Coordinates of C-alpha atoms and ligand atoms in Angstrom, one line a residue:
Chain A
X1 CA -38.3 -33.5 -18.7
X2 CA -36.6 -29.9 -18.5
X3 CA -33.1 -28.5 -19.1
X4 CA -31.7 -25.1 -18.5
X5 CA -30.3 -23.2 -21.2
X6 CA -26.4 -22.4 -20.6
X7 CA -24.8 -23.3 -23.2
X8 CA -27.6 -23.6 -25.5
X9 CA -28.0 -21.6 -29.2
X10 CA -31.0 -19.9 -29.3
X11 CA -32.7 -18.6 -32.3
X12 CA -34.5 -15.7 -31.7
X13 CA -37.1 -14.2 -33.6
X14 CA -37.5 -10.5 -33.4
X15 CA -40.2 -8.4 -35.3
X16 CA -39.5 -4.7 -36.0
X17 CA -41.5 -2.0 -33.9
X18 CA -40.6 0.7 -32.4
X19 CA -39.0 1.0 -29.2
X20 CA -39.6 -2.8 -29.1
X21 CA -37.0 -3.5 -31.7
X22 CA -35.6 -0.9 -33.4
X23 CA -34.0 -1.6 -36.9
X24 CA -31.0 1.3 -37.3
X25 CA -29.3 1.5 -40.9
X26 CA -25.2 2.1 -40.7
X27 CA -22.3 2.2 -43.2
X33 CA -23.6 -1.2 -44.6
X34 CA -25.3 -3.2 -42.6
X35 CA -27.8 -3.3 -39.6
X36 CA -28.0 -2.8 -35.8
X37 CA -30.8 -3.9 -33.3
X38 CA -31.6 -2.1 -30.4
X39 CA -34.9 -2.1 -28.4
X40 CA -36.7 -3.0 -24.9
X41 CA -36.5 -6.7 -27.5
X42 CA -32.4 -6.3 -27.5
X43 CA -31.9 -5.6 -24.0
X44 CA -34.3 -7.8 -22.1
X45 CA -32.5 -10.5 -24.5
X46 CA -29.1 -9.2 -23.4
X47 CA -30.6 -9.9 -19.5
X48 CA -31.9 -13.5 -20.2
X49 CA -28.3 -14.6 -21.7
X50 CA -26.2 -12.5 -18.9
X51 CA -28.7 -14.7 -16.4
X52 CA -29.2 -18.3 -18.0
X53 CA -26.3 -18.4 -20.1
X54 CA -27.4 -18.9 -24.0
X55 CA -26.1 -17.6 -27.2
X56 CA -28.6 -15.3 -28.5
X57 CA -28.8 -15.7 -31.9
X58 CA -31.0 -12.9 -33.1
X59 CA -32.9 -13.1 -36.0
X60 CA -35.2 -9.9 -37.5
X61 CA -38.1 -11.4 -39.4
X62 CA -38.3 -10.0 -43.2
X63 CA -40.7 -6.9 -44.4
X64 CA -43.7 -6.8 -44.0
X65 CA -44.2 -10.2 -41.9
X66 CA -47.1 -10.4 -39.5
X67 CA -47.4 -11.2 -35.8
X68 CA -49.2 -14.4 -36.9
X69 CA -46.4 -15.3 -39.6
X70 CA -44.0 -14.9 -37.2
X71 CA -45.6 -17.4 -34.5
X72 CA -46.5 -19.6 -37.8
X73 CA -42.5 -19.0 -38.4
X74 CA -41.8 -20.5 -35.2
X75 CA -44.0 -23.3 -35.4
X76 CA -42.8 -24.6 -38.8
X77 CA -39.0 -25.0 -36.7
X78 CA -37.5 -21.4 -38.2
X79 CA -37.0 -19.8 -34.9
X80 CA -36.6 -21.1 -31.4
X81 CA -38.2 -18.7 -29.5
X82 CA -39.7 -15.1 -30.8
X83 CA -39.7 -11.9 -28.5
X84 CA -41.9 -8.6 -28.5
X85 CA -44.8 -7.2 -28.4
X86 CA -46.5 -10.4 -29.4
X87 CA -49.9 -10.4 -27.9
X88 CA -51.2 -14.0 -26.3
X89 CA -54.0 -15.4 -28.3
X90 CA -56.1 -19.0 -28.0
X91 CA -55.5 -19.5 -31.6
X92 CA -51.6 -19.1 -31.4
X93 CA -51.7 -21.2 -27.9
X94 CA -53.0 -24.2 -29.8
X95 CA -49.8 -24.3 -32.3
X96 CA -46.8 -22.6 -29.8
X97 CA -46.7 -22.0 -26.1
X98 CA -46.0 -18.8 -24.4
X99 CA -43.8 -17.8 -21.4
X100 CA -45.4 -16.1 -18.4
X101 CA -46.3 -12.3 -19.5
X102 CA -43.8 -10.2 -19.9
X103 CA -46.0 -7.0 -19.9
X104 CA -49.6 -6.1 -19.6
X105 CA -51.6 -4.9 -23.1
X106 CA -54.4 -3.5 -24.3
X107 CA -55.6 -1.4 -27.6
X108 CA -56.4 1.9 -28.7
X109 CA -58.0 3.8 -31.8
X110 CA -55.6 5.6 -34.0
X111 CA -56.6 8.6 -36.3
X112 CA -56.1 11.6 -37.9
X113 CA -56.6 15.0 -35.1
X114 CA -59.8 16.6 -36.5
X115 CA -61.1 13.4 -37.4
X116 CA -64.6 13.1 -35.9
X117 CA -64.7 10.0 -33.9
X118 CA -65.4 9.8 -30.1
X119 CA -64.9 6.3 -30.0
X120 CA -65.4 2.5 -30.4
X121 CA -69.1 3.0 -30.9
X122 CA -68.7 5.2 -34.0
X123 CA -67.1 2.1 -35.6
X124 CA -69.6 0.0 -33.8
X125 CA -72.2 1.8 -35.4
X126 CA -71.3 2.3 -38.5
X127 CA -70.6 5.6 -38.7
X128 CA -67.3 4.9 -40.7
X129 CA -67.3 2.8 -43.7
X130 CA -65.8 -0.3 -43.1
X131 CA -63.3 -0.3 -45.7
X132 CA -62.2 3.2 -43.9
X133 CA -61.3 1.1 -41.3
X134 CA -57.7 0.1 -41.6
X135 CA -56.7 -3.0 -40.0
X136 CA -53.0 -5.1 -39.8
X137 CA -53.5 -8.7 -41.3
X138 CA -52.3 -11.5 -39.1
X139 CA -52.6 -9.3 -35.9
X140 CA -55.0 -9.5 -32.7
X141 CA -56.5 -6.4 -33.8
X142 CA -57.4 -8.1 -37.0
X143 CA -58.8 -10.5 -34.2
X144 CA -61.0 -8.3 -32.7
X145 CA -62.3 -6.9 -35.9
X146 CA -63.4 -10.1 -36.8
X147 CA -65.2 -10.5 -33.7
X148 CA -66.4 -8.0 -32.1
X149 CA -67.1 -5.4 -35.4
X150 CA -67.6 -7.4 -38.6
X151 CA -69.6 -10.4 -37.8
X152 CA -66.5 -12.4 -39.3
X153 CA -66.5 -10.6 -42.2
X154 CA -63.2 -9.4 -43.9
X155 CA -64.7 -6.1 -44.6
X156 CA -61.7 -3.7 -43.7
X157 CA -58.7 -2.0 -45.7
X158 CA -56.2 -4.5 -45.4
X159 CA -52.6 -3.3 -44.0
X160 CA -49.3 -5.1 -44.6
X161 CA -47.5 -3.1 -41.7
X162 CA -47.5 -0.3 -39.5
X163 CA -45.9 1.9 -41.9
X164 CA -48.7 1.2 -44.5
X165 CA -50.9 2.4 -41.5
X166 CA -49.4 5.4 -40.8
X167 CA -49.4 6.1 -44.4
X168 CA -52.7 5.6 -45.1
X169 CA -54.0 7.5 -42.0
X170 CA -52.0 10.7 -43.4
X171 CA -53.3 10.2 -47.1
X172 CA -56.6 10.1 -45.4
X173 CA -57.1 6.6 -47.4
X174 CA -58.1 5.2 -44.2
X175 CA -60.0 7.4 -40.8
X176 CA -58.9 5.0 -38.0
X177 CA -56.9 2.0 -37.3
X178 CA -56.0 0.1 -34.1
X179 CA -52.6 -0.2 -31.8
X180 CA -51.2 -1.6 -29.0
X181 CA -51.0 0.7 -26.3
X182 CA -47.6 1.2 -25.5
X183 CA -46.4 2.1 -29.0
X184 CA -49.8 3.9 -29.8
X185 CA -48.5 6.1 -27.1
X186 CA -45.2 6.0 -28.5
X187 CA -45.7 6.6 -31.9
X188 CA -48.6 9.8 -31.0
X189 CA -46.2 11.4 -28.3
X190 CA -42.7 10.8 -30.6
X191 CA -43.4 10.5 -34.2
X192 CA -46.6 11.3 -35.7
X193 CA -47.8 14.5 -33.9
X194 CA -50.7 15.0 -35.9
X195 CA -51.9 11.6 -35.1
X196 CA -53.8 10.6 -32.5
X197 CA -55.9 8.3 -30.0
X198 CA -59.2 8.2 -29.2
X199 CA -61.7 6.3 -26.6
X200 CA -61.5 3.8 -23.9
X201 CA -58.7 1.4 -24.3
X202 CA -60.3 -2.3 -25.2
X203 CA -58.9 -5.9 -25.3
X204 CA -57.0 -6.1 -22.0
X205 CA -54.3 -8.5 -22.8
X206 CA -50.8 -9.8 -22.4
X207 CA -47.6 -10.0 -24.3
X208 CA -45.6 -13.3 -23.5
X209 CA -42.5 -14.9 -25.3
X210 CA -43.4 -17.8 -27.5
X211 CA -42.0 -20.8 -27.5
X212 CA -42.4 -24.5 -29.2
X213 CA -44.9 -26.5 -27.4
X214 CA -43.8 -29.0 -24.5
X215 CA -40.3 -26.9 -24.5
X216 CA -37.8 -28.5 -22.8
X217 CA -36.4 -25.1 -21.4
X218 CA -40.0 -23.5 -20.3
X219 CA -39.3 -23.3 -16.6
X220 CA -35.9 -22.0 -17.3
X221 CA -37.1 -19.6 -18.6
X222 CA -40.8 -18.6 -16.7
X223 CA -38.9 -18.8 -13.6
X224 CA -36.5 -15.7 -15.5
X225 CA -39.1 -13.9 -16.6
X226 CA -40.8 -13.9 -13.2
X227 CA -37.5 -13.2 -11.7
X228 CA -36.7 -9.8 -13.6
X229 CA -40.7 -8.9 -13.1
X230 CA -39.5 -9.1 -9.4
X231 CA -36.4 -7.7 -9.2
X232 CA -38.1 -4.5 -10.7
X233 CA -35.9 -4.6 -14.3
X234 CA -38.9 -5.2 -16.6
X235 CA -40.8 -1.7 -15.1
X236 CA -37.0 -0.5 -15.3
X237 CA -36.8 -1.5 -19.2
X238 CA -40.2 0.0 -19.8
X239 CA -39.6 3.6 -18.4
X240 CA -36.2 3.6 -20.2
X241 CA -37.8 2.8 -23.7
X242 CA -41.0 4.3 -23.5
X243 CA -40.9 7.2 -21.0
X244 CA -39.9 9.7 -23.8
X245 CA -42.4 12.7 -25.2
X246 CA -40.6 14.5 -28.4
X247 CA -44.2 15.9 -29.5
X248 CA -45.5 19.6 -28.5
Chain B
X1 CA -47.0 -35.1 -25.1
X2 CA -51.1 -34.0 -24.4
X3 CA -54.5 -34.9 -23.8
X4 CA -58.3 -32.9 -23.9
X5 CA -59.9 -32.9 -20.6
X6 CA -63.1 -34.3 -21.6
X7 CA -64.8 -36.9 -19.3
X8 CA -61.7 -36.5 -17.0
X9 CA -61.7 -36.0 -13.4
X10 CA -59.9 -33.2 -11.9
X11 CA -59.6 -32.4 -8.5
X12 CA -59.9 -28.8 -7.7
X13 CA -58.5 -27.0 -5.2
X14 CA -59.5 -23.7 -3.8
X15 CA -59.4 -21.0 -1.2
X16 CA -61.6 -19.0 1.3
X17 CA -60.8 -15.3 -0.5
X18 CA -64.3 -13.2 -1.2
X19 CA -65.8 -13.0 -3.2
X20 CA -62.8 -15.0 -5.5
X21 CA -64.5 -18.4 -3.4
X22 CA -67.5 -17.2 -0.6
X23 CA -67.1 -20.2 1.8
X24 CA -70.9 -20.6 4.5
X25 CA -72.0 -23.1 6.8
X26 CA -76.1 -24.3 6.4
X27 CA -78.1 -26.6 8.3
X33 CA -74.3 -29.1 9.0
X34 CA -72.9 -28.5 5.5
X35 CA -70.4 -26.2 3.3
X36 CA -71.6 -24.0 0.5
X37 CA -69.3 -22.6 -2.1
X38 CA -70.1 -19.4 -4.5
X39 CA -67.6 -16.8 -6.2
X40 CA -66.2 -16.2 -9.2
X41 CA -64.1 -18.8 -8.8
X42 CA -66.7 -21.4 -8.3
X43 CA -68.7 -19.3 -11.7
X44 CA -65.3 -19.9 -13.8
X45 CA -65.4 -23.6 -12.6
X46 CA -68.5 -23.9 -14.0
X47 CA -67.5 -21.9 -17.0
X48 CA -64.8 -24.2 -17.8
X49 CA -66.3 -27.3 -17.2
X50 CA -69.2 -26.7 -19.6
X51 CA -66.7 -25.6 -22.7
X52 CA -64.0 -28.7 -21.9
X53 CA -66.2 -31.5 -20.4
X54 CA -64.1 -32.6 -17.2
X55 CA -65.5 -33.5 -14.1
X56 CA -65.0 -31.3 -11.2
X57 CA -64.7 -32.5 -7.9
X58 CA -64.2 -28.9 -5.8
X59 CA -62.1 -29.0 -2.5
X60 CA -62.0 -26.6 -0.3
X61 CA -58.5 -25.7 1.7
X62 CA -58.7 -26.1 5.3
X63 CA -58.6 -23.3 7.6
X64 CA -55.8 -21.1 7.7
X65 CA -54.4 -23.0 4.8
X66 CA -51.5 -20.5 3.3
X67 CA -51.1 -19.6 -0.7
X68 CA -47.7 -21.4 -0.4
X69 CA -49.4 -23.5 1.2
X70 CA -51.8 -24.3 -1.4
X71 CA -49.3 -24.5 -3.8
X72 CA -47.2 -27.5 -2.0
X73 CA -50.4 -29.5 -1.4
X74 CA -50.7 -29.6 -5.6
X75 CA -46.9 -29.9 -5.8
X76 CA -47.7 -33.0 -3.4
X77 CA -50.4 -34.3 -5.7
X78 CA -53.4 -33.4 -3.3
X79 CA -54.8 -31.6 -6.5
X80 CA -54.5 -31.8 -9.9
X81 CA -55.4 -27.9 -10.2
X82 CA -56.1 -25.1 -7.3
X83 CA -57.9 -22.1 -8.9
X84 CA -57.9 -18.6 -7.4
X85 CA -56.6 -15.3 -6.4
X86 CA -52.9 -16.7 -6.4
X87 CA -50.3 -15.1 -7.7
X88 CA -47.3 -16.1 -10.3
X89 CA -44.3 -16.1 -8.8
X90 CA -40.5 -17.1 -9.6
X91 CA -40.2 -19.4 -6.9
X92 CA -43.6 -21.2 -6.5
X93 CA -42.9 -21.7 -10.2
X94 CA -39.9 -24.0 -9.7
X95 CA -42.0 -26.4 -8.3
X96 CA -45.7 -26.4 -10.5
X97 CA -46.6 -24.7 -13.2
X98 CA -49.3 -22.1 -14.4
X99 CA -51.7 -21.5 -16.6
X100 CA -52.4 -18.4 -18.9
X101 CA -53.1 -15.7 -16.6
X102 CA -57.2 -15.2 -15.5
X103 CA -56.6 -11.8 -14.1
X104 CA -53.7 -8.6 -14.0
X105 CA -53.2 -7.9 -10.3
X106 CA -50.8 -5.8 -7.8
X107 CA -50.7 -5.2 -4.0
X108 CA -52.1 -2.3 -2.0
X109 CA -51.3 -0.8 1.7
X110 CA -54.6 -1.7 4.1
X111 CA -54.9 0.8 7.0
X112 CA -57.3 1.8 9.6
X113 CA -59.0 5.1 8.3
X114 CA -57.5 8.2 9.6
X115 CA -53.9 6.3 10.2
X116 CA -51.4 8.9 8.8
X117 CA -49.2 6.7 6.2
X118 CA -48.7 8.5 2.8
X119 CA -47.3 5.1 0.9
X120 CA -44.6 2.5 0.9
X121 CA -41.9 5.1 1.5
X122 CA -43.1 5.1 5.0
X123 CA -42.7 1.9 5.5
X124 CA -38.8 1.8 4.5
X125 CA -38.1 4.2 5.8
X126 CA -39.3 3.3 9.5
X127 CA -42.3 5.5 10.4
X128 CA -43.7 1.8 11.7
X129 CA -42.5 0.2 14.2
X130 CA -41.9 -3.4 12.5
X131 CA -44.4 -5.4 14.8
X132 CA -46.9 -3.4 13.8
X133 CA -46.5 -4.3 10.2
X134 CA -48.9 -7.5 9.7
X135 CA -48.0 -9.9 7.1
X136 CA -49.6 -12.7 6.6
X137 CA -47.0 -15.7 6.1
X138 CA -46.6 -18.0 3.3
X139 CA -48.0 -15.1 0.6
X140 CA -46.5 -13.0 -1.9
X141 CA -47.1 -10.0 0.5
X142 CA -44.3 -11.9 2.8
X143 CA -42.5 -12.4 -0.6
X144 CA -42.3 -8.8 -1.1
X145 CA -42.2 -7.8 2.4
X146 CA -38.3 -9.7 2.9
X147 CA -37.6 -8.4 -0.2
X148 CA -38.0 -4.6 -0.6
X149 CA -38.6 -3.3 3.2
X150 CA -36.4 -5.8 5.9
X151 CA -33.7 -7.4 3.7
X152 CA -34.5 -10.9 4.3
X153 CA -35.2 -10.3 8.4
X154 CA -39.0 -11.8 9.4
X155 CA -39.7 -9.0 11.6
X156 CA -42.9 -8.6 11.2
X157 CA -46.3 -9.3 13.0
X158 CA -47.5 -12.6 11.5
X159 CA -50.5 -13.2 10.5
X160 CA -52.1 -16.7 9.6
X161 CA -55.8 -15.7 7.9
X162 CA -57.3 -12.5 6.3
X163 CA -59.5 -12.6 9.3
X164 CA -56.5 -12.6 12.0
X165 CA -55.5 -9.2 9.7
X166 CA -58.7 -7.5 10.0
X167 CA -59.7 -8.4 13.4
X168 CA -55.9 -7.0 14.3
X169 CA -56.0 -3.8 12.4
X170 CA -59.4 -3.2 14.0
X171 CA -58.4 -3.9 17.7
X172 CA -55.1 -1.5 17.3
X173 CA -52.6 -4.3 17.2
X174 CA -51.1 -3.2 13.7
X175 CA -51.3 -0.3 12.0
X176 CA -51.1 -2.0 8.3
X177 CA -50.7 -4.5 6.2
X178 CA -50.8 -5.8 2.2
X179 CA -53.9 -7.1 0.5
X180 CA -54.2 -7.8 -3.5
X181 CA -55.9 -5.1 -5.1
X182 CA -59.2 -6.6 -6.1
X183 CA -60.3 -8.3 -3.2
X184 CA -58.7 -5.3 -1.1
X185 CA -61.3 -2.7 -3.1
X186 CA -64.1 -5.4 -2.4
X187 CA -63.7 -5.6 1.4
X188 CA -63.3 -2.0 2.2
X189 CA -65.8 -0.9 0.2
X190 CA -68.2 -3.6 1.3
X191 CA -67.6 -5.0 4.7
X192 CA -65.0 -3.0 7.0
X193 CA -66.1 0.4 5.9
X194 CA -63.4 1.5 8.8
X195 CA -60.4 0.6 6.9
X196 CA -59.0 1.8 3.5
X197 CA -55.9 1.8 1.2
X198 CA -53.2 4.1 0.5
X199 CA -50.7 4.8 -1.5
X200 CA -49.5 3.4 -5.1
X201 CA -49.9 0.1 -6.5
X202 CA -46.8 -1.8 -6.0
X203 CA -45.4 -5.7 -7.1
X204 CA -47.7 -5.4 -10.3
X205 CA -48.4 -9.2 -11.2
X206 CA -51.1 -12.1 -12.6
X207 CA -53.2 -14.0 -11.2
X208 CA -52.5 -18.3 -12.8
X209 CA -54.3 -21.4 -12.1
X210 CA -52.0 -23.7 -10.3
X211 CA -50.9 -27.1 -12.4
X212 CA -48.4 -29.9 -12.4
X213 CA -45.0 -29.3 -14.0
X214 CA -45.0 -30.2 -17.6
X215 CA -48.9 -31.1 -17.7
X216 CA -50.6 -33.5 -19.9
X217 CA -53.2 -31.2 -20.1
X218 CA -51.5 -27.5 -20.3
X219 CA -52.9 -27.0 -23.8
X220 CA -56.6 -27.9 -23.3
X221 CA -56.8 -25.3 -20.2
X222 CA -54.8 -22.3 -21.8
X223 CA -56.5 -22.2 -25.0
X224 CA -59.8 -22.3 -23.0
X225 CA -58.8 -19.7 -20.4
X226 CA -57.6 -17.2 -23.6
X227 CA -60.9 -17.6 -25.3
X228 CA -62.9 -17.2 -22.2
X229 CA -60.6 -13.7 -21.9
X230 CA -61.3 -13.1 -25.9
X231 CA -65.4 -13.7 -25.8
X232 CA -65.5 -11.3 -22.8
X233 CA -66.1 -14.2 -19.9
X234 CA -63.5 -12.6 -17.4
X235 CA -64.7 -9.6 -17.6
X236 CA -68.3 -10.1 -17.2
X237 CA -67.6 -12.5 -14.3
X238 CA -65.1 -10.2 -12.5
X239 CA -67.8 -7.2 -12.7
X240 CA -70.7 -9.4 -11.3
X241 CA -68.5 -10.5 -8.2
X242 CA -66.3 -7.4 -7.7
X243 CA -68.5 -4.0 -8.9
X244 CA -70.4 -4.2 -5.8
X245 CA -69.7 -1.0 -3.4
X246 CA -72.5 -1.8 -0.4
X247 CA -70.3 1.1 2.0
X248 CA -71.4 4.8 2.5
Ligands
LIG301 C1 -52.9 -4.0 -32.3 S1 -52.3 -5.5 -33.1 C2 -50.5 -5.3 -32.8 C3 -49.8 -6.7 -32.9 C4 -50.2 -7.6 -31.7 N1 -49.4 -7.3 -30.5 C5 -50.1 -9.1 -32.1 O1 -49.4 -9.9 -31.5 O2 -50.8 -9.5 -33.1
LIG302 C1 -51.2 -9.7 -0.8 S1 -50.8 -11.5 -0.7 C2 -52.4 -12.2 -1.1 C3 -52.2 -13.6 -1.6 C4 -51.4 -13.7 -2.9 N1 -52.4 -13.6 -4.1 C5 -50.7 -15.0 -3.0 O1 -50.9 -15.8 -4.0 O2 -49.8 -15.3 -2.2
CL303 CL1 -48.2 -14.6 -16.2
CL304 CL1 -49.4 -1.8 -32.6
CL305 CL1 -48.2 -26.9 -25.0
CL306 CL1 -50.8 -14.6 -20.2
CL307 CL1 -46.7 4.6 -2.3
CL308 CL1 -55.4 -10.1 -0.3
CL309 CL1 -42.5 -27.0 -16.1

């Protein structure tokens, strides 16, 4: 059957990332604020839960947070959680909540045009620096390696950016919207490179054979609509600090 | 609970759209070909089920489409139709096969700069043609007459064309992909204009809380993953046969 969700406690999983979900320091404890935080704050306005928001711990992965979910810890999880077949078979997902695809990351001055210099092998592969339990480990696997495990292995995208500056690694891969982000607000010596690749979604996951799934598809779809998902993306991501 | 496909019958519906599903008459018979008909067979071979293929009649709306699955004449319908908030109270969607969004058809040389035109009146509202029971007339009601169905309505593709070409309306709304495909393959009069607008996805059509959800998303996200889509959407939509 099916159910809507007013009244309902949901736990939420969030994953840190910026402007997704933004994880802010104060005297002490800690704030959320994101795109994440105010599409929740949308949903429960709209349907009527009680958002219990829950920030995953260091250093978790995309795939440890949908495993998270599966094993009961979280009700639903929201961000920039890309749509897989493998996750599908363990969790469900909502309708998309945004359109996704990746780029490279490097150093400026590095000498790469593009996917074909990994491709080719033009970096070594353990220059290559790639997020475990993340679709771009995904597409590693497939579509570089041959299934082999070959890369510098990365526990977060701080670890990424660090590694990219120490010049441990030469390239790595993001999501476009925070690639942009990150390149046109944080790290302006970083940069991307080539023709995006994996054309994607992001969608909210959820247990499978949810009692509250068209509750909350018919949402989603709803603020799609009504414009306030393009509205939530220009006000989180239409910022440029860098020269 | 859920269920794999395999050996199971499923009766598919789908739609005259090209080249999404190319409908001809031989010597009497019907012959179907498309992308539509390519991802059938795509499908099929990877989850075993039995397709038995049925063709819409005539002048058969998306919406109505939709209610003839919602009535059980289907168990899926497969093609260009798009995810919406209100067709999704009543069935259910799969993953998304394709991104999509709407663009403004006009004759060539018609002087319309985008959709600002058409709220703010430069077109008389009879000589906007919307076809009825699509997400065009969706977004029509919505963003340009505040609920009022004032327009000219239209009841096929071809009552669009053939009235844009004989001067009876000056535009109308077609989804991007098959818009690009018949202007720049078979009315090499008319064109589009202006921005992108109701950005969206393209879902096959299921029943509400599916036995069989699972089985088709997983297999739809790996078809996206081992490059599928893409392959089929360039061999039915890269084709530019005008001058
Ligand atoms: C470029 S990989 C970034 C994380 C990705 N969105 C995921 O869900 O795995
Ligand atoms: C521009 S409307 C074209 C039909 C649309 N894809 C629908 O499902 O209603
Ligand atoms: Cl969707
Ligand atoms: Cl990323
Ligand atoms: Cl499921
Ligand atoms: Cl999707
Ligand atoms: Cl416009
Ligand atoms: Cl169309
Ligand atoms: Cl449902």
């Amino acid at each position: 059957g099916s159910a809507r969700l007013k009244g309902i406690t949901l736990r939420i999983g969030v994953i840190e990332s910026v402007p997704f979900t933004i994880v802010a320091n104060v005297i002490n404890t800690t704030k959320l604020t994101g795109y994440v935080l105010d599409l929740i704050e949308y949903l429960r306005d709209k349907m009527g839960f009680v958002a219990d928001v829950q920030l995953a711990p260091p250093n978790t992965s995309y795939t440890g947070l949908v495993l998270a979910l599966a094993n009961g810890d979280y009700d639903i999880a929201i961000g920039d959680i890309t749509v897989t077949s493998a996750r599908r078979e363990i969790v469900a997902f909502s309708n998309s909540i945004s359109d996704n695809s990746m780029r490279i990351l490097m150093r400026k001055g590095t000498l790469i045009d593009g996917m074909d210099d990994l491709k080719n092998g033009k970096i070594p592969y353990n220059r290559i620096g790639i997020r475990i339990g993340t679709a771009g480990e995904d597409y590693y696997l497939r579509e570089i390696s041959g299934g082999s495990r070959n890369f510098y292995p990365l526990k977060s995208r701080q670890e990424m950016y660090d590694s990219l500056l120490a010049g441990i690694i030469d390239v790595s891969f993001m999501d476009i919207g925070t690639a942009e982000y990150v390149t046109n607000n944080i790290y302006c010596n970083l940069t991307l490179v080539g023709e995006d690749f994996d054309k994607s979604t992001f969608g909210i996951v959820t247990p499978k054979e949810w009692l509250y799934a068209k509750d909350l598809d018919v949402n989603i779809l709803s603020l799609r609509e009504t414009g306030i998902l393009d509205n939530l993306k220009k006000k989180w991501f239409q910022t440029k600090a860098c020269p």
